[PDB]
Design a protein around this ligand. Structure first.
Ligand SMILES: Cc1cc2nc3c(=O)[nH]c(=O)nc-3n(C[C@H](O)[C@H](O)[C@H](O)COP(=O)(O)O)c2cc1C
Ligand SMILES: Cc1cc2nc3c(=O)[nH]c(=O)nc-3n(C[C@H](O)[C@H](O)[C@H](O)COP(=O)(O)O)c2cc1C
Ligand SMILES: Cc1cc2nc3c(=O)[nH]c(=O)nc-3n(C[C@H](O)[C@H](O)[C@H](O)COP(=O)(O)O)c2cc1C
Ligand SMILES: Cc1cc2nc3c(=O)[nH]c(=O)nc-3n(C[C@H](O)[C@H](O)[C@H](O)COP(=O)(O)O)c2cc1C
Lengths: 298, 298, 298, 298
């Protein structure tokens, strides 16, 4: 019932922009490594049956496409060092940009050494902390979110790039304010409009992705932003970039192809990127950064 | 065809608000007694068959949940002192906050002693006068509403707290103006959007609850306000509170569970409050009062 | 596909207005006689079979309700003095306010004496000229509308009150401008939203009644205005009055009851007026004139 | 899913404008010849089977109605001088205004002499260059659009009038900017809302005709503009003219009648023009130029 808000925007088509489709470059460095496109495979947990199966389809595809990939919560990896193989993905993705995952609420039960061990076990290149009071609140799970930001601030200068994200309910402007002084490497807005890790009566609460991207960019103008949350088409990707994002992330829609092998995942991402490439071209932008502003309301 | 208007508002979700769900306190003193939640069971008459049956289900639940309860018009109690047992509810609700009810149009046929007798017979803690020109007008009932406010003003300083309410068609800003100098204890906006005591072609007339809450708060900034009229979910409750209300009231939806015993009523209110609690938490509010303003348009 | 626009307005319900339904007076003098309500039976031609039958049902009802009545084009009466009995209605409506009708385009084929003869034959109290370039244009009929206003200006000071009206496509503000210096007795806005005498691909052209009432009132603030064109309910009547009208007129919906006798017509008008009376009461207005402004957008 | 935007506008009906339908003159000179109406038959290619068949139905009709006609891309005529008869239409349309067609992207493979030969072979009166990066991009065709405008600027002073057009995706204001200094004879906005030569997931990109007409007129106030792209009714034609256009063009809808002979095409255009004539009349405009501004929003 709640959309991303991107349908309330129009890409500014430029018939006489004078570009050559081949001129558009999607190359975009992120978190230390250089990506072939401003795309990330969203974080996903799912089941322990298909777990390892899915991660390897995504990772392999990611490696082929030169795209980044966020792993699901390594939470269990701390307590169950045996579910290590379920995530170990470097075997099929040796050079890809991998981002470890963990709930920010875990900072009260895990210290620096645990964080280092997690990304080291996974051979990850960065760590993303997800914060989801709403989800954990509705699930009567762990609802104490006090001092987490201050707890991260203490730790923050870490040996690898660190980022923060929501899980489909979005980050508001005052949320970006709370992150303003932290030396983060990036932020994933993860707004409402697509799927909610919580859903998978109160699920009307949340911030539309389009809205989140605008609010967060205003507060953190210089930080690299990841637009995710129902940003399912290359066209929507371009809109997100024009509103202020730097990277796009897709999770849910990738489940289907992930169960049918890397070839299918790779194809999905491929349609999305080629579609993104046409949009930037039609927009007069020669790269993701140039898409900024080339969008209007109504 | 006419909504409360609350769908035109968005709760401002705060992922990084830094609260613990357990930190949100719903305790709110009202009309002399202290409630466990800012909730009231709306006034209802219905039939003489189920009459006593329903009141006792509501009252008992109210007592268990620490919530307030408005009784239906005690009109008949004045003329028929035998329908006394139909309302006598203290038997099952000894400490709850009970609010006697009576049409403001009755002030022309009843004096001070009658008002005192009514709340004393009911062992009520306050008296609420409902004013419904539209309803009585459409029902060709008693349509003379002259001098009622002046009549109440004369009486007003009474031995117990007194309030005024509509019945599903709402109170406008100029209505709040007419109540401005009266020493009332509270006001129930009772707007359009849910059910109309009148309905239960002209029923398009009326003021949307969301609209009424805004208008009345502007005129009576310091007075405690009750938002009612299709405020059926905890989410809608939070929106009402953020727009300016202090208490929520639900009537109609409570009929079903009231006919199936207190256990069912209590469960309904329970879902509503726990749902309200999540919303305040998701909003960054630690209590009803803090919800104020944490809502935006569109 | 095009509405009156009145659905985009909300009557301002006044719970504490302090009126008595019996206090609202609909009496409104118009074109020389005093009406019991600000209502007129719209002009209608139809067929020559039911012609006389319908006029007598309307006229009789009009007489009973103290309402005005506009006759259909007396055009044929000029050329065919035998269709005199088809309109002769005084037999059943001796004191009612009757308004003769004639296309403004006829001023080029008829002079003063013809106009006097027409209203005298009909025993009418006034003459209304309808101007419908669109309708006659679509019907490839007589489309020369040059100098008609100047032609009426020359004649205008007539022995009886004269007015101008459209036929369901509305009068714009610049239209009111063209009528500004004429000594007219009243104007019927007759906008789009209900039925079009033309309809009974281009019928999207026209001005919504709500829109016409606003535009014309702005240009002719002091002149009495008749709101017509899909103003089918008492509620819509009140809205029209609050937007600036002084009288309401309904045509089409009256056909059905007119074929079933005066008793049915009279009943229809009766529901409409009693419904109008409730609305003014709910609005805080004690008469049609006081309804002005008691309406808001959205 | 994307409309022209013309539905968001209302023609300003003028009941008292004082015109005679016969007073409205559609005569409008364009590209050197004088048209009986501000109408052009849009450019269409289609198939090689019906090719010649369709062109002759359109051309013949154009000749009868005194309207202009744009031919499909003469691209093939350059390489295949045998498909000359497929376009040769003067046989049935000796005096009509014919406009040769060619993709602007061809300027990199064709020089002045080739352009002269093309219009001379076709016995055309002007040349229209269509620019469609989006279409060619989605069709993985020729996507290099660099230096085309500068290439045309060099050539531009040609022996005949030259114009530029899109193909159903529209020209933006910055597009008009890129054409600002070129000595063009006219511009065809060809916006989104009707059909896209490309369509015949990314086809949401583009500029609504209504929007394009406004943007382009603002940048090129003095240049004659052609509104096309789902401008299928005379009413829509009038709206386009009131927004700023000078000529209307319809392509797709003309296919059906073109396959059933000139008589059918001629009839279609005939309904459209007579419908356009009524609209200007209803609007108070005595010709296409006077329609300007006689339209409002909402
Ligand atoms: C099955 C499923 C599992 C998920 N697991 C995680 C997880 O472990 N960690 C995390 O930070 N987000 C997780 N998410 C959230 C996504 O990374 C992110 O919120 C995203 O915005 C939702 O997918 P998207 O909008 O394409 O649909 C999960 C989402 C889904 C649907
Ligand atoms: C069956 C029924 C009986 C009611 N009886 C009373 C009554 O005696 N006194 C009163 O002040 N309001 C009465 N109301 C009005 C409600 O207290 C109040 O207007 C409310 O806003 C309508 O319920 P709510 O919006 O949840 O649905 C009654 C409403 C219903 C549906
Ligand atoms: C069958 C029919 C006949 C009409 N005849 C006349 C007529 O003779 N003269 C006139 O001025 N208007 C005539 N009208 C127009 C109405 O008086 C007026 O335009 C009105 O706004 C249309 O009815 P209303 O909106 O309730 O539906 C006629 C309308 C209808 C439907
Ligand atoms: C079958 C078809 C063939 C077309 N061929 C050409 C062409 O050769 N050259 C051109 O410039 N435009 C061509 N167009 C585009 C139209 O001239 C123009 O874009 C128009 O706006 C689309 O038709 P309209 O909106 O009525 O529907 C073609 C369109 C269609 C549907």
């Amino acid at each position: 019932k709640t959309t991303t808000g991107l349908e309330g925007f129009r890409l500014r088509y430029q018939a006489l922009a004078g570009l050559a489709l081949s001129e558009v470059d999607l190359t975009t460095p992120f978190l230390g490594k250089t990506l072939k496109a401003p795309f990330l495979i969203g974080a996903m947990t799912g089941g322990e049956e298909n777990g390892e199966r899915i991660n390897l389809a995504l990772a392999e595809a990611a490696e082929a496409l030169g795209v980044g990939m966020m792993l699901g919560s390594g939470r269990i990896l701390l307590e169950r060092p045996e579910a290590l193989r379920s995530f170990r993905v470097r075997k099929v993705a040796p050079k890809a940009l991998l981002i470890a995952n963990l709930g920010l609420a875990q900072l009260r039960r895990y210290g620096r050494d645990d964080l280092l061990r997690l990304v080291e076990m996974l051979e990850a290149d960065a760590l993303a902390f997800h914060v989801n009071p709403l989800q954990e609140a509705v699930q009567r799970g762990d609802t104490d979110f006090r001092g987490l930001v201050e707890r991260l601030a203490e730790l923050l200068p870490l040996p690898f790039p660190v980022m923060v994200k929501e899980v489909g309910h979005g980050l508001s402007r005052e949320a970006a304010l709370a992150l303003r002084d932290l030396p983060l490497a990036a932020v994933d807005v993860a707004g409402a409009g697509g799927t909610s890790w919580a859903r998978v009566e109160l699920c009307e609460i949340g911030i539309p992705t389009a809205r989140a991207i605008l609010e967060v960019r205003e507060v953190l103008p210089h930080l690299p932003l990841v637009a995710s949350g129902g940003v399912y088409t290359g066209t929507d990707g371009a809109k997100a970039l024009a509103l202020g994002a730097d990277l796009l992330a897709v999770a849910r829609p990738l489940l289907r192809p992930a169960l049918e092998g890397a070839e299918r995942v790779a194809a999905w991402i491929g349609d999305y990127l080629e579609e993104l490439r046409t949009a930037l071209f039609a927009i007069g932008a020669r790269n993701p950064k140039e898409a900024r502003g080339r969008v209007e309301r109504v």
